[PDB]
CSV table of C-alpha atoms in Angstrom, one decimal:
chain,number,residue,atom,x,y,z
A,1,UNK,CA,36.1,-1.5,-37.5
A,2,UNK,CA,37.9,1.0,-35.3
A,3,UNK,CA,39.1,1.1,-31.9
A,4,UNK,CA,36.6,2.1,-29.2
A,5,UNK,CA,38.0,5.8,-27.3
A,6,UNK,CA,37.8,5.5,-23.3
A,7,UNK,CA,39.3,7.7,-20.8
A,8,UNK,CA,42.3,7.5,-18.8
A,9,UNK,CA,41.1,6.4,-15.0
A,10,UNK,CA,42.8,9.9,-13.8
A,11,UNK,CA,39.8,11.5,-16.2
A,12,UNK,CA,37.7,9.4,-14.2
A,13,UNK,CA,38.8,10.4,-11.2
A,14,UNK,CA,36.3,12.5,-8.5
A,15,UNK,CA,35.3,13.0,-5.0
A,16,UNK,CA,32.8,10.8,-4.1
A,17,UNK,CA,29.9,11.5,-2.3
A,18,UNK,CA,29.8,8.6,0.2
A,19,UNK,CA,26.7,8.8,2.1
A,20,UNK,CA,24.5,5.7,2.5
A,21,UNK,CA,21.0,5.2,0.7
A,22,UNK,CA,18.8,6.3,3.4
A,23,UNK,CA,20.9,9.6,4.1
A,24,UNK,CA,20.2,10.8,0.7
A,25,UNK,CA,16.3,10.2,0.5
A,26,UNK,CA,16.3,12.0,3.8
A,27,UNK,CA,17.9,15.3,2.2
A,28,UNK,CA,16.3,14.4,-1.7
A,29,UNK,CA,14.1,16.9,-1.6
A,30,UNK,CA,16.0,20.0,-0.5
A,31,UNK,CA,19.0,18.7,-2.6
A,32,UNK,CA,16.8,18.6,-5.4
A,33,UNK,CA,15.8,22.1,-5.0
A,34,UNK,CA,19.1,23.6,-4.4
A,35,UNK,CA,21.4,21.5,-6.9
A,36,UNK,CA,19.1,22.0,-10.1
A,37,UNK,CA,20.9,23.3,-12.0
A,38,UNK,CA,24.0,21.9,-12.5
A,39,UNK,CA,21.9,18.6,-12.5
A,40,UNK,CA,19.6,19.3,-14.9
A,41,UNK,CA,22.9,20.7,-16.9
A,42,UNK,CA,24.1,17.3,-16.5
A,43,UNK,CA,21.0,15.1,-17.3
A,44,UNK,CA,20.4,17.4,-20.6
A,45,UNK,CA,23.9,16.6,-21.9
A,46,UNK,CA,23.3,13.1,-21.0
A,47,UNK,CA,20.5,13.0,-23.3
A,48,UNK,CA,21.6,15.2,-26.1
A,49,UNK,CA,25.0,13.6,-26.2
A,50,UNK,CA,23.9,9.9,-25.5
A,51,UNK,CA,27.5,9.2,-24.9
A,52,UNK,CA,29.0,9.3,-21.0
A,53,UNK,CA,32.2,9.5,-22.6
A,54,UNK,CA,31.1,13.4,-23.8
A,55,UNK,CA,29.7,14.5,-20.0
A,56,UNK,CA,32.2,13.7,-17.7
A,57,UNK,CA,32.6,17.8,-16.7
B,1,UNK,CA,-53.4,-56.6,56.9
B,2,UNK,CA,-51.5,-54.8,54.2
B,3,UNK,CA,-52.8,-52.5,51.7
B,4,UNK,CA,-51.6,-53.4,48.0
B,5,UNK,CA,-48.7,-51.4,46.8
B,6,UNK,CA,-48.1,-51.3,43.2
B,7,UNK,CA,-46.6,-48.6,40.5
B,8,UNK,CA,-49.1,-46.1,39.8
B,9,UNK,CA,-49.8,-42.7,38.8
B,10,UNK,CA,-50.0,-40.0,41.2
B,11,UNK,CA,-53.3,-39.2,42.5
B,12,UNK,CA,-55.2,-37.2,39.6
B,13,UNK,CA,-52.3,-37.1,36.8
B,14,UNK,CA,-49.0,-36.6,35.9
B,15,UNK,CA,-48.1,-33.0,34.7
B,16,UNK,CA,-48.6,-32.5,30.3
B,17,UNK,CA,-46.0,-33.7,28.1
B,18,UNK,CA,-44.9,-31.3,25.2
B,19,UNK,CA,-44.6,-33.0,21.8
B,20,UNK,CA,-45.2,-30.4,18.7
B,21,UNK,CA,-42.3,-28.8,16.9
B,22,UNK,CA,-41.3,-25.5,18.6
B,23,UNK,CA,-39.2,-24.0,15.8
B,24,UNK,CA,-39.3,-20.0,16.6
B,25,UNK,CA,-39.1,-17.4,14.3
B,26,UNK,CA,-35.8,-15.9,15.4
B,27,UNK,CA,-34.9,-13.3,13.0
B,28,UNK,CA,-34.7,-9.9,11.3
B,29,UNK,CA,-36.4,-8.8,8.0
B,30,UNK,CA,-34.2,-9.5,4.7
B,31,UNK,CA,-35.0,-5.6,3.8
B,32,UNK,CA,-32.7,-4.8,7.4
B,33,UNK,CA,-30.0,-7.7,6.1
B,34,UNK,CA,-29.7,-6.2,2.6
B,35,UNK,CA,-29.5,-2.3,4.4
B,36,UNK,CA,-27.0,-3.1,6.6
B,37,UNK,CA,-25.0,-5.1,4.2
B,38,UNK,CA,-25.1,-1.8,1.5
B,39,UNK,CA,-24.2,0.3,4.9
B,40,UNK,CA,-20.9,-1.5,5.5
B,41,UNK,CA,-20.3,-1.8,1.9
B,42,UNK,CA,-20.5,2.1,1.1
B,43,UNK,CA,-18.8,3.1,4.5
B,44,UNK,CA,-15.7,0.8,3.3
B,45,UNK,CA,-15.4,2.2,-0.3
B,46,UNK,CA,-15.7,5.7,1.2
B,47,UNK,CA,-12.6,4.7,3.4
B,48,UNK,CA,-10.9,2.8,0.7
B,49,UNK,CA,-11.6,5.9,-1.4
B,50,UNK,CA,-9.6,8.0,1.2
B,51,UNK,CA,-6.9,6.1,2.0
B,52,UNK,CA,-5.8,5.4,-1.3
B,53,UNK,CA,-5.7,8.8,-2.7
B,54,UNK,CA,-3.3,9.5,0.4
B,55,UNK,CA,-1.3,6.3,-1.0
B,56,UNK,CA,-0.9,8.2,-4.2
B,57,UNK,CA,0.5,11.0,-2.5
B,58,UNK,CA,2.7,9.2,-0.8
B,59,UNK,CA,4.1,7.3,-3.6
B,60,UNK,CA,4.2,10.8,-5.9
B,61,UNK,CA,6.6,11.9,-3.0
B,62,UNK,CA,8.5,8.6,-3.0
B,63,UNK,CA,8.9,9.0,-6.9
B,64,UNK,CA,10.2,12.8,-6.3
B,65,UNK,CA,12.8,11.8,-4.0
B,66,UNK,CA,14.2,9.5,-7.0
B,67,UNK,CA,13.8,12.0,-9.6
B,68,UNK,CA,16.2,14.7,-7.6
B,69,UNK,CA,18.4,11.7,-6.7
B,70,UNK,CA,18.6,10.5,-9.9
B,71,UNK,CA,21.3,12.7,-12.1
């Protein structure tokens, strides 16, 4: 019945942030605070779009 | 000439025996038991009472931390 889209793994492609588990519950609070909004930008695509495929940006 | 020597009592009598049931008393009043019991009981809950609010404080803040980890 059609074939499913994906992205190519270059779209896929980002710097990771690779600090461990503990590291970011000790800075969740102030992280929270200061990256709202492109977060919250993020989470309200996420849930308007109900694709990951349409909020990659 | 000798006396006769035999087992006998001491001269007048031997010292009283004891033999009725001494069960004492030995006690506190139930009223005291019961009060102190209720004491314990309602300085516990008011402990209880304190520590677990702070417990849902501290788990509010645990569940924050996930919330601005989360996106």
């Amino acid at each position: 019945p059609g074939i499913v889209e994906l992205p190519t793994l270059e779209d896929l492609k980002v710097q990771e942030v690779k600090v461990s588990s503990s590291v970011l519950k000790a800075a969740a609070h102030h992280y929270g605070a200061q990256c709202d909004k492109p977060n919250k930008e993020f989470m309200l695509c996420r849930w308007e779009e109900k694709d990951p495929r349409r909020c990659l940006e | 000439a000798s006396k006769v020597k035999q087992d006998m009592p001491p001269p007048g009598g031997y010292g009283p025996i004891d033999y009725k049931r001494n069960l004492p008393r030995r006690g506190l009043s139930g009223y005291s038991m019961f009060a102190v019991g209720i004491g314990t009981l309602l300085f516990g809950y008011w402990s209880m009472m304190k520590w677990n609010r702070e417990r849902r404080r501290l788990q509010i803040e645990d569940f924050e931390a996930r919330i601005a980890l989360m996106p």
